[PDB]
Structures are given as structure tokens and as C-alpha cells.
């Protein structure tokens, strides 16, 4: 809302398209769940806890090089402040976090601190998982099944997000449908259905549909991008830019749309380590180059961004022959604040649980 927050908001969202794209290119990646503000706060923590190039690269990945450290941390702090979020930095038992950093990381980033022994890999995974399950009240019971780097710092973000519709789906408008992962592979899913007046645009040339679903009290909106038929998202992802989104939004008009969506919890854990280094955060990730002396003792081993995103019917309590928005194939979605235009989420659903 404030000048600092609004100016820092555009940057965090510019990084959202950047990170989503880098992840979308990775062949091992299926579903994507990213909170731009949370990702940005991780870079802020590196800048807060780092010196020289380690910290200057963090500001650079944020496109915040020409901003004062205070402006970055206050601006991100304000931006950051159903949604359950927990941020914790795990360091080896041989390390001790500095008082000044602990105080500031708590003040700006609501950051938590913990010492961890990897001697028993099971007990270390147990601590991280239990902390994530409590943070999300059991919605995210597991973060990772392995910790590949045990000599560095582990930044862990655990989140639960459940969009609450401005116009609820009927609790009985739920049934079993097939979700087409590919033209040859179908998974049995639960789908929720509703017909109402929605901002919509059907791009007949680029063979896609875009729908805007307002969240409670029209404070934010969930936007869905989907191709006409089953196809890999690679084609649509080329079109996905901040600019092309604006064009689509402007071309949208309120129409009768019968929206059918998969119902359930989508659990995704990303290790942002290699992707942020691909974006310019090279020093922080390197054991021999990292300078995180403001935290004291070493290097950034992993940046776990773990989310339980729930698609449910729940929301706040004539029309022409409706257009169908039948989401039974992979799609891209964004959660956007109405006032600021700031991205709360960017993601994709390629393969649901069933």
C-alpha cells in the first residue's frame, strides 16, 4: 500500500514471471506453486544476512540494486504482512546465529531460527516436516524426503493457501471426472462446478481461454489460463508475460461462464537453490564463495518453497447460454491483489493427485 511496498511489489512480481519460466523449462518439474512475495523475502534475507557480492547479487535478482537496504527490508516486510505461512532458517549444530540478524530477520521477514544435526538424516527430516505440519495445521505434512546438502544453511518456507471465492460453489456441485494429463493419460479426479458472471476472454487465434475468478470482497482474483484442448503448457508459457497478461485482462468482458475445476489439495515442494543461481544468485549458493557473516559461522544449501494449495467449493454466500471453462487438462493460474496488482501466487496444474 505505502510507496516503499508498492515499488517493491512490482519487482517481486517481475521476479515471479522470471522464476516461473525457469522452473517451467526444467523437465523434472510437474506442478508449480510459487508465492512471489515469499520468494522475494528469501532474497531479502540473503541481502540482510550477507556481505559484498553475496548481498549485492540478492538485490540484483530483486532488481533492487539502486534501493537502500532499509527500503528493501521495510518494503518487503510490509508486503509480506486462508493463508498460513512459516519461514525458518536451519543451520548446522556447529553454527550460531547473530543477535542483530535474529532481531531484524524476525522484524522484517518473520523469520524463525533453528540448529540442526544431520548425523541422523531421519531426525533432521522429522524436525523440518513436523515444523511444516504445525505451521500449516497438517495441510502440508511433509516438505522433503531428502536433504542433498547437509553442510550449509537450509531456508524453509511452508505454506497453506485456500482461495475463498467471492461467489461460492454449491457443496453438492462436486462429482468424479477424468483429468487429461496427456491425450493418452487420464487420471480420476474430483471436480467442482459453477455457472456465473465472470470476466472472460476466448483467444481463438492463440487457442486459449482466460477467466478471472474474484476472491472474497473482490480484494483479489484468481486468474486461470488454459489452452482449448489437451496439450503441454510449453506453448502457452511462451505467451505468458506481464505485458501479454495486461492485453488479455483488457480484452476480457463479463460473460456467463460454467467453470469446472479439479477439487482438492495440491502439494508442491520446490528447491529454489539452482533456479535463483540461474537468475543471478551465484555467490550465496557456493560454499567457497558465500559470505553470510551477518548471520555468522555458512552458505545457502537449499531454499525450500513448499505449498499446500487447496481448491475447494467454499466462498461468500437471467444469464445467457454459458461458455464452458472445463479445466480437465493442464492450466496456468495466478492470484492477484485487485488494488496493487501484486502477485500472491503463480503456478500450474499439470498432474493432480486423484
Amino acid at each position: 500500500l505505502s510507496p516503499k511496498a508498492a515499488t517493491l511489489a512490482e519487482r517481486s512480481a517481475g521476479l515471479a514471471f522470471s522464476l516461473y519460466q525457469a522452473m517451467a523449462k526444467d523437465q523434472a518439474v510437474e506442478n508449480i506453486l510459487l508465492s512471489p512475495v515469499v520468494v522475494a523475502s528469501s532474497l531479502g534475507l540473503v541481502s540482510l544476512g550477507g556481505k559484498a557480492t553475496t548481498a549485492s547479487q540478492a538485490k540484483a535478482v530483486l532488481s533492487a540494486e539502486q534501493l537502500r537496504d532499509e527500503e528493501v527490508h521495510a518494503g518487503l516486510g510490509e508486503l509480506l504482512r486462508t493463508w498460513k505461512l512459516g519461514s525458518r532458517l536451519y543451520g548446522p549444530s556447529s553454527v550460531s546465529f547473530a543477535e542483530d540478524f535474529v532481531r531484524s530477520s524476525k522484524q522484517h521477514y518473520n523469520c524463525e531460527h533453528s540448529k540442526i544435526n544431520f548425523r541422523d538424516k531421519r531426525s533432521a527430516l522429522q524436525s523440518i516436516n513436523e515444523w511444516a505440519a504445525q505451521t500449516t495445521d497438517g495441510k502440508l505434512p511433509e516438505v522433503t524426503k531428502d536433504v542433498e546438502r547437509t553442510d550449509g544453511a537450509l531456508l524453509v518456507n511452508a505454506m497453506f493457501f485456500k482461495p475463498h471465492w467471492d461467489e461460492k460453489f454449491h457443496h453438492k456441485m462436486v462429482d468424479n471426472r477424468g483429468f487429461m494429463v496427456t491425450r493418452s493419460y487420464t487420471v480420476g479426479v474430483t471436480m467442482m462446478h459453477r455457472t456465473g458472471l465472470y470476466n472472460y476472454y476466448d483467444d481463438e487465434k492463440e487457442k486459449l481461454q482466460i477467466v478471472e475468478m474474484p476472491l472474497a470482497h473482490k480484494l483479489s482474483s484468481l486468474i486461470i489460463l488454459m489452452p482449448h484442448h489437451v496439450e503441454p503448457l510449453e506453448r502457452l508459457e511462451k505467451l505468458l508475460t506481464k505485458e501479454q497478461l495486461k492485453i488479455w485482462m483488457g480484452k476480457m468482458q463479463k460473460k456467463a461462464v460454467a467453470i469446472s475445476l479439479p477439487k482438492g489439495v495440491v502439494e508442491v515442494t520446490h528447491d529454489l537453490q539452482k533456479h535463483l543461481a540461474g537468475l543471478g544468485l551465484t555467490e550465496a549458493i557456493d560454499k567457497n564463495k558465500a559470505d553470510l557473516s551477518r548471520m555468522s559461522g555458512l552458505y545457502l544449501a537449499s531454499v525450500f518453497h513448499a505449498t499446500a494449495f487447496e481448491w475447494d467449493t467454499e466462498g461468500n454466500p437471467e444469464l445467457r447460454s454459458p461458455k464452458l471453462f472445463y479445466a480437465d487438462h493442464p492450466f496456468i493460474f495466478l492470484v492477484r491483489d485487485t488494488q496493487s496488482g501484486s502477485l500472491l501466487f503463480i503456478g500450474r496444474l499439470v498432474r493432480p493427485k486423484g
Binding site: 454449491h170 456441485m173 462429482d175 471426472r177 491425450r183 471436480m191 469446472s260
Partner: peptide
């Protein structure tokens, strides 16, 4: 209220 839309049709030959 009207029921949900029907299932997707079969693929083309």
C-alpha cells in the same frame, strides 16, 4: 440450480 455440465465428448478418429 442446474446440474454440472456433462463429461467431455470422445476424441476424434
Amino acid at each position: 440450480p442446474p446440474g454440472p455440465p456433462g463429461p467431455r465428448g470422445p476424441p476424434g478418429p
